């Protein structure tokens with residue numbers, strides 16, 4: 172499980188700006204914070220984790236302060252931008268921890284490209300980032316309090332909280348949901364499509380079969396989300412006319428027991 | 437600047453007359469500013485819920501739009517996307533399969 176806090180910031184000019192955050196544990200959204208809300212919203216019964224109402228109060232406040240301080244500091248640091256203080260500015264932060272039976276991260280993108288990371292005890296630019304960024308990151312690395320606060324959040328606060336999240340939403344992260352499959356085809360060669368939807372967790376096995384012969388050339392689509400946090404996936408096979416008869420789609424998933432789905436074309 | 441990819445599909449096997457949920461997943465775009473509308477017979481559907489804007493490992497934005505619908509043999513459904521990287525809006529029709 173990877174825990175990620177995802178912040179998206181849009182700076183249109185010197186005086187219009189919005190920032191929004193969404194937080195994920197594995198592939199389940201746990202929180203949301205819109206620009207127009209003073210407070211973070213939980214999107215899960217267990218989003219507060221094993222934290223006290225005061226443990227949540229304090230931490231929320233740290234973030235409320237931070238959100239204001241980030242808005243104003245970027246506005247300042249943007250003046251130092253190369254050729255001219257260029258507009259629409261888009262900033263993105265990905266922060267959190269990769270929880271193993273943990274390693275933390277804090278990455279920053281500017282204009283859609285990864286330019287900055289916090290690493291160890293300080294901010295550093297990434298190789299091939301715009302050189303105009305070096306000074307802004309010097310100014311920032313002079314703030315010893317923030318650096319200490321960021322070290323505490325990454326090294327200590329994040330892992331502890333996430334651990335509380337995992338205990339609290341065990342029954343949700345452990346939920347098992349069954350795929351339902353159906354077949355179709357598209358237009359003398361044709362493409363056979365096996366659609367597989369409504370399954371959870373994400374890991375799945377779909378394949379066109381000719382008896383016990385796995386059909387290499389079965390092409391898997393991408394995982395597409397459904398609204399209720401189940402997945403959708405389809406797998407296809409190119410077939411000549413009269414190559415259709417004898418073919419089946421086989422789906423294995425954790426939730427089926429040892430009872431695969433086999434649908435015959 | 438990244439151009440939006442659009443994929444359109446149902447929660448459930450689409451059977452004519454049977455209430456379903458239609459999805460429209462727009463990915464691979466930048467900047468985050470986008471307009472999505474789901475259509476029925478070329479006309480905007482009013483009860484379209486949307487996910488929060490999120491972004492991916494590769495820094496590109498994605499969102500999920502979805503709406504209750506019932507497949508029919510007389511109705512066409514579509515997804516229409518306006519983004520600054522495109523000249524005119526881009527529509528993709530649901531192919532009664534997905």
Ligand SMILES: CCCCCCCCCCCCCC[C@@H](O)[C@@H](O)[C@H](CO[C@H]1O[C@H](CO)[C@H](O)[C@H](O)[C@H]1O)NC(=O)CCCCCCC
Pocket residue numbers: 233236237238240241244245246248249266277279281287307314315316317320321
């Ligand atoms: C436009 C140039 C591009 C720059 C790209 C790099 C920017 C990285 C963005 C992260 C910067 C955080 C900005 C806030 C920080 O500068 C500072 O103003 C505040 C306020 O600082 C002041 O108060 C604190 C107490 O909160 C300290 O006492 C600090 O010493 C003091 O300066 N610090 C905090 O809110 C705490 C740290 C939370 C950051 C975690 C990010 C996920």
Ligand SMILES: *[C@@H]1O[C@H](CO)[C@@H](O[C@@H]2O[C@H](CO)[C@@H](O)[C@H](O)[C@H]2NC(C)=O)[C@H](O)[C@H]1NC(C)=O
Pocket residue numbers: 290291292293322323326
């Ligand atoms: C947070 O973790 C980082 C990651 O290891 C720690 O930074 C290291 O600290 C030691 C001792 O100061 C240095 O010799 C290493 O060089 C540091 N790593 C890097 C790459 O900078 C950091 O000290 C931890 N901080 C807290 C508050 O526990």
Ligand SMILES: CCCCCCCCCCCCCCCC
Pocket residue numbers: 176177178192193194202204211234264265266267324325328329332
């Ligand atoms: C980069 C952060 C954007 C704002 C998101 C606020 C989410 C609050 C819940 C996270 C609690 C864990 C703290 C460690 C985060 C690095």
Ligand SMILES: *[C@@H]1O[C@H](CO)[C@@H](O)[C@H](O)[C@H]1NC(C)=O
Pocket residue numbers: 183184185186187
């Ligand atoms: C700042 O930009 C926003 C962009 O949405 C716009 O609404 C506003 O008119 C602009 N104002 C200035 C300072 O020109």
Ligand SMILES: *[C@@H]1O[C@H](CO)[C@@H](O)[C@H](O)[C@H]1NC(C)=O
Pocket residue numbers: 187188189190206207
């Ligand atoms: C976002 O929030 C800030 C702080 O509450 C506020 O001043 C501003 O009006 C908001 N930005 C926009 C464009 O709505």
